[PDB]
Amino acid sequence: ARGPKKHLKRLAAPHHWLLDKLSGCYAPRPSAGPHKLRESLPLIVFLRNRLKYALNGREVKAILMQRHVKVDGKVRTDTTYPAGFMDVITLDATNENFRLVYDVKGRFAVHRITDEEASYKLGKVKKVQLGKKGVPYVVTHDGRTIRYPDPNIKVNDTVKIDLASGKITDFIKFDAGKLVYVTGGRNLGRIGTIVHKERHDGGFDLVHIKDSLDNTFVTRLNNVFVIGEQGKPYISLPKGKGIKLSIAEERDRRRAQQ
Amino acid sequence: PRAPRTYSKTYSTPKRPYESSRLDAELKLAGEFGLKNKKEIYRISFQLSKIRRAARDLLTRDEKDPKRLFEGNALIRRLVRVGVLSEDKKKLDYVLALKVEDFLERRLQTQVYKLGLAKSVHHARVLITQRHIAVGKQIVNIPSFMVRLDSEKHIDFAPTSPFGGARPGRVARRNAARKAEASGE
Amino acid sequence: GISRDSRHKRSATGAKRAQFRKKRKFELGRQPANTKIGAKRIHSVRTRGGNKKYRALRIETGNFSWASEGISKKTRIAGVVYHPSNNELVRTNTLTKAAIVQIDATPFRQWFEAHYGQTLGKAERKWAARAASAKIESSVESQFSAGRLYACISSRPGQSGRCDGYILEGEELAFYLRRLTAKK
RNA sequence: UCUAAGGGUCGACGAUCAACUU
RNA sequence: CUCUUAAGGUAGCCAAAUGCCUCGUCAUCUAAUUAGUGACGCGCAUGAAUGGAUUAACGAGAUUCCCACUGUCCCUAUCUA
RNA sequence: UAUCUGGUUGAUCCUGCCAGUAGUCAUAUGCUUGUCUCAAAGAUUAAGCCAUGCAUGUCUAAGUAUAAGCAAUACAGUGAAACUGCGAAUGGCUCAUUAAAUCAGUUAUCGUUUAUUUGAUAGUUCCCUACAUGGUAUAACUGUGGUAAUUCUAGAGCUAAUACAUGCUUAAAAUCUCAGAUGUAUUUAUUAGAUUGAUGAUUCAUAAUAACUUUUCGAAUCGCAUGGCCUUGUGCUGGCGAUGGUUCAUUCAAAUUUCUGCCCUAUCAACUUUCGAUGGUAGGAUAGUGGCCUACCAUGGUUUCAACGGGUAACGGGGAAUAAGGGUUCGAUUCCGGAGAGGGAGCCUGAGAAACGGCUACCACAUCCAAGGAAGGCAGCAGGCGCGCAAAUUACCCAAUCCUAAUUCAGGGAGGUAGUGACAAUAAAUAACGAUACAUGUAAUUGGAAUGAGUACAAUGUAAAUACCUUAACGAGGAACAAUUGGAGGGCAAGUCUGGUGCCAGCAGCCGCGGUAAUUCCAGCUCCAAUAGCGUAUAUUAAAGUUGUUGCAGUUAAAAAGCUCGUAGUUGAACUUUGGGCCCGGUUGCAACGGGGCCUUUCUUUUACUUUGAAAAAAUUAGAGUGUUCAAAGCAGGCGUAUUGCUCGAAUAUAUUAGCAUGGAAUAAUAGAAUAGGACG
RNA sequence: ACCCACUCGGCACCUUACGAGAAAUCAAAGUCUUUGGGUUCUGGGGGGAGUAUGGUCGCAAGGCUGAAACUUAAAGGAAUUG
RNA sequence: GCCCGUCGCUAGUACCGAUUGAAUGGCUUAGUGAGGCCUCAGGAUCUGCUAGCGGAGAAUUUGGACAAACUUGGUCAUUUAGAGGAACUAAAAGUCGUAACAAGGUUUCCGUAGGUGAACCUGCGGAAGGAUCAUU
Ligand SMILES: [Mg+2]
Ligand SMILES: [Mg+2]
Ligand SMILES: [Mg+2]
Ligand SMILES: [Mg+2]
Ligand SMILES: [Mg+2]
Ligand SMILES: [Mg+2]
Ligand SMILES: [Mg+2]
Ligand SMILES: [Mg+2]
Ligand SMILES: [Mg+2]
Ligand SMILES: [Mg+2]
Ligand SMILES: [Mg+2]
Ligand SMILES: [Mg+2]
Ligand SMILES: [Mg+2]
Ligand SMILES: [Mg+2]
Ligand SMILES: [Mg+2]
Ligand SMILES: [Mg+2]
Ligand SMILES: [Mg+2]
Ligand SMILES: [Mg+2]
Ligand SMILES: [Mg+2]
Ligand SMILES: [Mg+2]
Ligand SMILES: [Mg+2]
Ligand SMILES: [Mg+2]
Ligand SMILES: [Mg+2]
Ligand SMILES: [Mg+2]
Ligand SMILES: [Mg+2]
Ligand SMILES: [Mg+2]
Ligand SMILES: [Mg+2]
Ligand SMILES: [Mg+2]
Ligand SMILES: [Mg+2]
Ligand SMILES: [Mg+2]
Ligand SMILES: [Mg+2]
Ligand SMILES: [Mg+2]
Ligand SMILES: [Mg+2]
Ligand SMILES: [Mg+2]
Ligand SMILES: [Mg+2]
Ligand SMILES: [Mg+2]
Ligand SMILES: [Mg+2]
């Protein structure tokens, strides 16, 4: 329709932003950036709806233009910067670091972390490709290209990214029995261990995941993110650890507060 | 434009307009409970039809089916909280076997009367309409209120509303200002 | 202008399609280059995405490769002798991909002499190292006595502005020689 | 000014010969 | 209801190359139509192999309109044998 | 939330329709209209025509400042104008076109372009400036003007760049050619790319060789700080940044694209094919695939499983109304996709438009004019005309939601706010309680309270208000602060009441009522229904098992073809591992029910079906929680205090057509070895 | 040829109806609200009307296909008593 | 009792119909063809290096493809006029008869054909929905 759209009408925004319906006609359209339009979370949304620090978008940009907010080590003064999964949002005024991770309901949970582990971040290797001059490189889930990767880093593996030098410190290899986050689909926000991978040449790769409670759910390889081995996640998990209690036991946990 | 504003009807007229037995039953209910019009009975029967539909959908499901368990428990909880479903009838079949008077009993216009705060249901209606009744720390001027079975211990007069506190009223002041003259001085 | 859309061009059942969506710029075609010979004239076309194409009109020199010794000398195109798509292109000497042209062959003879030193068409022992196994063919050298080498265009002059190509060799050359000794 | 198609005789082709119609 | 015949003109068709009145009446065609066409029909005096009605094709047959075309005309002029 | 009733007869039972009845975010219209919350609204007819005003502009520290612009030893700040850059392709409107088209779900790009964002990435450039090249350049500005008029511009004099055009500095390392070449970009050819990376798969990524280019890039740019070492000079170095730039990846996208799915119509059965229709080769063109176009060649491609044609008062979908179940109808319209900007067509710029608040032309309209000429496009927001049954203010504002730019600041009729508004929806004032007489109720017999409908200091709210919430004083007695809209024969609740009219006037959806005895008209009284609403008209849904798959009927009520054959379609007998036994282990209450595994002669045809799973945006629907005072709603909120704060949420289900993955192997189809060209190692 | 008994197939018939139907009646018109063996054709109140128009067949007569505007509260079936 | 048709009056709705009728809209052959775009050229004047020679270049201009639009013709669709003709319906207690319902006074009806003011009559074949379930 003659070009790229610059508006995002409310009720067209991604639902996991928990945006109010009758606030205005429009939502913050995620600018082009590292992750995606749908799988992103704008800094305005995370500053005005997930922490209530700012009250308006004006106040969000006021917070942003004095270099308070910081996404993955850099300033990111963009009001609608598309921060996403495994991103580190550190603010030095009110010094605290968050890691954008998915709760078990499928929203971007507010997950405070410490500087000693916010130093780095994780990245799912989107592709391994030889660049110009025969220099190998890896592309990660957040759109990062890292040259001279370990010759044993393949697709669907995860790499620990320094986030200050932007290099690969370690890498977890996709295989049966490693801890995986689910970053899309019905089970978006669950954590489990890889049990089996169905190949489906041509079609879509499927993976069967068994959470701590021995629940076994299958999902597409596109949205599973290796985060370490069982019991040793290379990152800190949010308050729920992706267990996916049913509504009955959720109501039970709720009524356990009398 | 802004997202649409959801709205629903709350009542349903009867299919037969001039059924004399239904008319007499509606007038009996309206006289007993001090109702302004047949639309209040219509609204209560609409709520009851929705409740009955949900209960029927659940009862057709298998027992210990998670959806039936969860939603029937929620419906029964809501009904016993409102006081329509009694304490010993938490089975989802008594939900089906409920009635219009079970909802008309929990009306604040009925509770105010049954608590002696009013001389009749019409006294209760005017007393709620005139901001005289407070449920908690909150004046409630709506006859249809569906007391939560905990507000029952708290339905009393307001600090306003010169039957339960500070002020003496409005016509009392003018009658005092004219009784000053009526005294002669 | 010219449109490459399929909203015209009635469907496979034969039904005539109703029109919607007035012609879109992302479906435009353009005019053929009809590259001629001589006095190079290249025009820059602005294409989608800010890119540039080069319409070759009247091209004089092309880069042709022998493909047997891998030289790719730059030479002069004499004329078009065969075109599989239109004899009118041969008549008009219109330079075009897959056109069979004739090239000067003088740079190729000079390279053959500076490389093998073996009197093709009329630092000492490099000619010895490139040993007696230098017989090219009985049809690629008989053309050197006339100084015209049969070649096939491989670039697209209307698209890239260049008229590069390769010298005919082997069964391709036999095929085109049969075609030429028929149609000539 | 050209292009194409449509033949005879002789020994998948080769040699030779020939008239116009499109 | 009459008088009346061998039978009382049927099916059709018409101001028709058959209708006096008559340039019939209505419509169409035109600026204007005794023309043409379509209808109407108590039709001087239409009508059934003295053939009625109709008909594709055909016609140096009679007729009306239209397009083209033009010295037929407006309005004549000029050239050749 | 599975209902019927009146009307054919003297009466009956049916068929059957008409009529009634109920709903409609479904429109109009009539009457009436007190309060709070919510808020549809020129779609229908004329994608008809439009006066006027606004709707797109934009600056940081960080492109260019000698404003004769302001203000307290080159400007040090601000800064009009202008050049430059970016944007103006988003938004908003409308539904005219459009029926395999759009669109929906699902695919592909190993078939391409992609400004921007994000990340990575460039020691190789020279055939007498690099301690920095030119005007070949110009704007704004200064002065001279033409025209009636335009966001018209000529003529002359300067002036810069991150505008324009050129153009060097980086050794060392480094191999091939016979000292030179060797970065990248373009084009071609060849080579490797294995079994030395990837993919299911490549002529992929990538590298190499030989060359090739009307030269591509390889900063001649800017801000704030100035630091360290020192031949103390115009030294050498060194920050944090901004902007720019090649390529790759990423993102926002785009364009094509797989499969399946659109309403009525046969009084549309053949359609397409010279003039591209289907395919092949080659080319051209495109960003790229492709008959997209061209040349040559072949004669194909669609179709009763409905092609092609015609109609649509047809934009598609999410969804809406109604709904026992199944369905019927609707969907111009809050979100997604498409298309258009009076009708066509063409094109500039740009990453992106076949753009119309851009241009060019024609057609139809139509403005101005000094007659020479010039300027247009409300289906943006208001507003006018016209059309109509049918739809609001030429209002305020960027505070919210977001968007745009050079950007924290400016702009935004996008949007919000208010005005109109009985579209629709929510809650629910018009009275309540005593005394006296009479037999719990009757009376213009009377008393004390209560309140908001209003009105209004303030204060909250708001961008500034308005209103709502909260309230000082006022503001109830036939509380005239007076409720209506339709009815009273039946259907259908309610009158042999009174007066009037006399087959008239009229009523009456239908049956009927009215002709001097009217329960039916006109009224009065009384009564009934719903009620701030009620009636009427049209449409549609239920009623309708009167469209019937569930689920109709066809002897006589409408309906079995005159009869038989017969293609498509639909449908089609039975039969192939059953039955013992041993285990492990689940879920519910030793039992029941469900599995999985072994033995018992026993451990990769094609489909349908079905289980499970992923998918099927949000809104909507069902629905969990939550005292918006209740409610419609909304996604909030809750818990304690004198903190310098703690905490739960914004679930879940369904869309069962098509595709995908998985378990089952009954049902139904299909294939196996018969001239053995069969199986086994 | 006939008689008796049985049997298959056929034209029918008599009685009774579990059953069906509005009934007349029906061994199918039954096995139908306890509604599904397969399949073709037809009807949707009465007229206008098997009309007009178009198509097609026919020598013609006509056949096949086949509306609409408009109109109407009945028309119709079986049976009962007069 | 019920009832049928012609004819006559009134009103309404459709139909046929000379007029090579009319209007509007869609599609389209042919002709002409604006405009931009690509292309063959062209060279005002605008500066540069030395009459030698280059660069930028407006008007104009050739040929193409894209093509609006107009004219003519064809075709389709939808409205619409029309002398006259021929129906249907409604109303009307008009005229003529009495065709059907009883064996309706000739049983009725179906197909077909012919005839007659009108219902109708008649021939041929058929049906009972007949006025006969019946002659071993
Ligand atoms: Mg006669
Ligand atoms: Mg005559
Ligand atoms: Mg005549
Ligand atoms: Mg004449
Ligand atoms: Mg005779
Ligand atoms: Mg005669
Ligand atoms: Mg003759
Ligand atoms: Mg009805
Ligand atoms: Mg309109
Ligand atoms: Mg848009
Ligand atoms: Mg490659
Ligand atoms: Mg090709
Ligand atoms: Mg529709
Ligand atoms: Mg339309
Ligand atoms: Mg729509
Ligand atoms: Mg419309
Ligand atoms: Mg839209
Ligand atoms: Mg457009
Ligand atoms: Mg308009
Ligand atoms: Mg346009
Ligand atoms: Mg406009
Ligand atoms: Mg626009
Ligand atoms: Mg408007
Ligand atoms: Mg009142
Ligand atoms: Mg108030
Ligand atoms: Mg009355
Ligand atoms: Mg009654
Ligand atoms: Mg029926
Ligand atoms: Mg009959
Ligand atoms: Mg019948
Ligand atoms: Mg068959
Ligand atoms: Mg079988
Ligand atoms: Mg009928
Ligand atoms: Mg009868
Ligand atoms: Mg008779
Ligand atoms: Mg008779
Ligand atoms: Mg008789």
mmCIF file of N, CA and C (backbone and C1' of nucleotides) in Angstrom, chain F residues 60-81:
data_model
loop_
_atom_site.group_PDB
_atom_site.id
_atom_site.type_symbol
_atom_site.label_atom_id
_atom_site.label_comp_id
_atom_site.label_asym_id
_atom_site.label_seq_id
_atom_site.Cartn_x
_atom_site.Cartn_y
_atom_site.Cartn_z
ATOM 1 P P U F 60 16.378 22.245 18.231
ATOM 2 O "O5'" U F 60 17.729 21.762 18.921
ATOM 3 C "C5'" U F 60 17.753 20.608 19.745
ATOM 4 C "C4'" U F 60 18.957 19.749 19.459
ATOM 5 C "C3'" U F 60 20.311 20.374 19.754
ATOM 6 O "O3'" U F 60 20.674 20.302 21.124
ATOM 7 C "C1'" U F 60 20.351 19.396 17.608
ATOM 8 P P A F 61 20.684 21.627 22.036
ATOM 9 O "O5'" A F 61 22.047 22.359 21.657
ATOM 10 C "C5'" A F 61 23.293 21.913 22.186
ATOM 11 C "C4'" A F 61 24.418 22.131 21.205
ATOM 12 C "C3'" A F 61 24.095 21.722 19.777
ATOM 13 O "O3'" A F 61 24.807 22.552 18.863
ATOM 14 C "C1'" A F 61 25.862 20.374 20.597
ATOM 15 P P A F 62 24.227 22.778 17.384
ATOM 16 O "O5'" A F 62 24.882 21.598 16.539
ATOM 17 C "C5'" A F 62 26.274 21.595 16.264
ATOM 18 C "C4'" A F 62 26.756 20.241 15.804
ATOM 19 C "C3'" A F 62 25.842 19.472 14.873
ATOM 20 O "O3'" A F 62 25.909 19.957 13.550
ATOM 21 C "C1'" A F 62 26.801 18.010 16.480
ATOM 22 P P G F 63 24.583 20.128 12.670
ATOM 23 O "O5'" G F 63 25.170 20.313 11.207
ATOM 24 C "C5'" G F 63 26.434 19.764 10.873
ATOM 25 C "C4'" G F 63 26.825 20.128 9.469
ATOM 26 C "C3'" G F 63 26.878 21.619 9.171
ATOM 27 O "O3'" G F 63 28.106 22.218 9.544
ATOM 28 C "C1'" G F 63 25.563 20.563 7.544
ATOM 29 P P U F 64 28.132 23.724 10.103
ATOM 30 O "O5'" U F 64 27.748 24.611 8.839
ATOM 31 C "C5'" U F 64 28.562 24.607 7.678
ATOM 32 C "C4'" U F 64 27.915 25.344 6.533
ATOM 33 C "C3'" U F 64 27.539 26.791 6.787
ATOM 34 O "O3'" U F 64 28.645 27.673 6.758
ATOM 35 C "C1'" U F 64 25.777 25.710 5.655
ATOM 36 P P A F 65 29.067 28.477 8.084
ATOM 37 O "O5'" A F 65 28.374 29.901 7.913
ATOM 38 C "C5'" A F 65 26.965 30.053 8.049
ATOM 39 C "C4'" A F 65 26.578 31.504 8.179
ATOM 40 C "C3'" A F 65 27.162 32.217 9.395
ATOM 41 O "O3'" A F 65 27.410 33.582 9.069
ATOM 42 C "C1'" A F 65 24.806 32.274 9.507
ATOM 43 P P U F 66 28.723 33.984 8.237
ATOM 44 O "O5'" U F 66 28.885 35.542 8.515
ATOM 45 C "C5'" U F 66 28.845 36.051 9.842
ATOM 46 C "C4'" U F 66 28.385 37.487 9.877
ATOM 47 C "C3'" U F 66 27.017 37.742 9.247
ATOM 48 O "O3'" U F 66 26.302 38.684 10.036
ATOM 49 C "C1'" U F 66 28.634 39.137 8.234
ATOM 50 P P A F 67 24.758 38.417 10.365
ATOM 51 O "O5'" A F 67 24.065 38.476 8.934
ATOM 52 C "C5'" A F 67 22.865 37.769 8.680
ATOM 53 C "C4'" A F 67 21.739 38.715 8.369
ATOM 54 C "C3'" A F 67 21.487 39.802 9.403
ATOM 55 O "O3'" A F 67 22.360 40.910 9.250
ATOM 56 C "C1'" A F 67 19.444 38.763 8.844
ATOM 57 P P A F 68 22.471 42.038 10.392
ATOM 58 O "O5'" A F 68 21.287 43.047 10.051
ATOM 59 C "C5'" A F 68 21.211 44.323 10.667
ATOM 60 C "C4'" A F 68 20.913 45.400 9.654
ATOM 61 C "C3'" A F 68 20.114 44.963 8.434
ATOM 62 O "O3'" A F 68 18.714 44.946 8.675
ATOM 63 C "C1'" A F 68 22.002 46.215 7.744
ATOM 64 P P G F 69 17.814 43.695 8.212
ATOM 65 O "O5'" G F 69 17.210 43.131 9.576
ATOM 66 C "C5'" G F 69 17.990 43.125 10.763
ATOM 67 C "C4'" G F 69 17.214 42.623 11.953
ATOM 68 C "C3'" G F 69 17.759 43.036 13.310
ATOM 69 O "O3'" G F 69 17.353 44.342 13.681
ATOM 70 C "C1'" G F 69 17.269 40.722 13.323
ATOM 71 P P C F 70 17.851 44.990 15.064
ATOM 72 O "O5'" C F 70 16.860 44.387 16.156
ATOM 73 C "C5'" C F 70 17.216 44.365 17.529
ATOM 74 C "C4'" C F 70 16.867 43.047 18.176
ATOM 75 C "C3'" C F 70 17.497 42.799 19.537
ATOM 76 O "O3'" C F 70 16.758 43.390 20.590
ATOM 77 C "C1'" C F 70 17.723 40.866 18.167
ATOM 78 P P A F 71 17.106 44.872 21.100
ATOM 79 O "O5'" A F 71 17.164 44.721 22.684
ATOM 80 C "C5'" A F 71 18.401 44.506 23.343
ATOM 81 C "C4'" A F 71 18.594 43.058 23.713
ATOM 82 C "C3'" A F 71 19.899 42.724 24.416
ATOM 83 O "O3'" A F 71 19.878 43.024 25.799
ATOM 84 C "C1'" A F 71 19.543 41.178 22.679
ATOM 85 P P A F 72 21.218 43.514 26.535
ATOM 86 O "O5'" A F 72 21.743 42.212 27.287
ATOM 87 C "C5'" A F 72 22.107 42.263 28.660
ATOM 88 C "C4'" A F 72 23.602 42.343 28.841
ATOM 89 C "C3'" A F 72 24.282 43.581 28.279
ATOM 90 O "O3'" A F 72 24.161 44.712 29.124
ATOM 91 C "C1'" A F 72 25.505 41.660 27.657
ATOM 92 P P U F 73 37.512 37.408 21.355
ATOM 93 O "O5'" U F 73 37.604 38.268 20.019
ATOM 94 C "C5'" U F 73 37.309 39.657 20.030
ATOM 95 C "C4'" U F 73 37.843 40.348 18.803
ATOM 96 C "C3'" U F 73 39.297 40.061 18.459
ATOM 97 O "O3'" U F 73 39.541 38.790 17.848
ATOM 98 C "C1'" U F 73 38.954 42.388 18.431
ATOM 99 P P A F 74 39.034 38.390 16.369
ATOM 100 O "O5'" A F 74 37.445 38.448 16.457
ATOM 101 C "C5'" A F 74 36.690 39.241 15.552
ATOM 102 C "C4'" A F 74 35.666 38.420 14.808
ATOM 103 C "C3'" A F 74 35.012 37.301 15.603
ATOM 104 O "O3'" A F 74 33.925 37.756 16.386
ATOM 105 C "C1'" A F 74 35.747 36.462 13.520
ATOM 106 P P C F 75 33.737 37.233 17.892
ATOM 107 O "O5'" C F 75 32.169 36.990 18.012
ATOM 108 C "C5'" C F 75 31.253 37.732 17.220
ATOM 109 C "C4'" C F 75 30.422 36.823 16.352
ATOM 110 C "C3'" C F 75 29.949 35.540 17.010
ATOM 111 O "O3'" C F 75 28.809 35.717 17.836
ATOM 112 C "C1'" C F 75 30.821 35.056 14.860
ATOM 113 P P A F 76 28.942 35.599 19.435
ATOM 114 O "O5'" A F 76 28.495 34.103 19.772
ATOM 115 C "C5'" A F 76 28.801 33.021 18.897
ATOM 116 C "C4'" A F 76 29.452 31.868 19.620
ATOM 117 C "C3'" A F 76 28.928 31.600 21.029
ATOM 118 O "O3'" A F 76 28.872 30.192 21.248
ATOM 119 C "C1'" A F 76 31.263 31.939 21.100
ATOM 120 P P G F 77 27.579 29.362 20.778
ATOM 121 O "O5'" G F 77 26.357 30.224 21.329
ATOM 122 C "C5'" G F 77 26.087 30.291 22.720
ATOM 123 C "C4'" G F 77 24.837 31.080 23.006
ATOM 124 C "C3'" G F 77 23.692 30.898 22.029
ATOM 125 O "O3'" G F 77 22.971 29.698 22.243
ATOM 126 C "C1'" G F 77 23.951 33.194 22.542
ATOM 127 P P U F 78 22.277 28.946 21.007
ATOM 128 O "O5'" U F 78 21.014 29.853 20.669
ATOM 129 C "C5'" U F 78 19.998 30.081 21.634
ATOM 130 C "C4'" U F 78 19.133 31.253 21.251
ATOM 131 C "C3'" U F 78 18.447 31.155 19.897
ATOM 132 O "O3'" U F 78 17.255 30.390 19.937
ATOM 133 C "C1'" U F 78 19.456 33.280 20.119
ATOM 134 P P G F 79 16.818 29.512 18.665
ATOM 135 O "O5'" G F 79 16.854 30.540 17.446
ATOM 136 C "C5'" G F 79 15.816 31.495 17.260
ATOM 137 C "C4'" G F 79 16.200 32.533 16.235
ATOM 138 C "C3'" G F 79 16.404 32.021 14.819
ATOM 139 O "O3'" G F 79 15.187 31.880 14.111
ATOM 140 C "C1'" G F 79 18.229 33.382 15.420
ATOM 141 P P A F 80 15.027 30.745 12.985
ATOM 142 O "O5'" A F 80 14.083 31.435 11.906
ATOM 143 C "C5'" A F 80 12.838 31.992 12.297
ATOM 144 C "C4'" A F 80 12.542 33.274 11.565
ATOM 145 C "C3'" A F 80 12.542 33.199 10.051
ATOM 146 O "O3'" A F 80 11.362 32.623 9.516
ATOM 147 C "C1'" A F 80 13.740 35.109 10.732
ATOM 148 P P A F 81 11.460 31.379 8.503
ATOM 149 O "O5'" A F 81 12.198 31.974 7.225
ATOM 150 C "C5'" A F 81 11.700 33.129 6.567
ATOM 151 C "C4'" A F 81 12.668 33.626 5.526
ATOM 152 C "C3'" A F 81 13.274 32.563 4.632
ATOM 153 O "O3'" A F 81 12.400 32.138 3.602
ATOM 154 C "C1'" A F 81 14.976 34.006 5.386
#
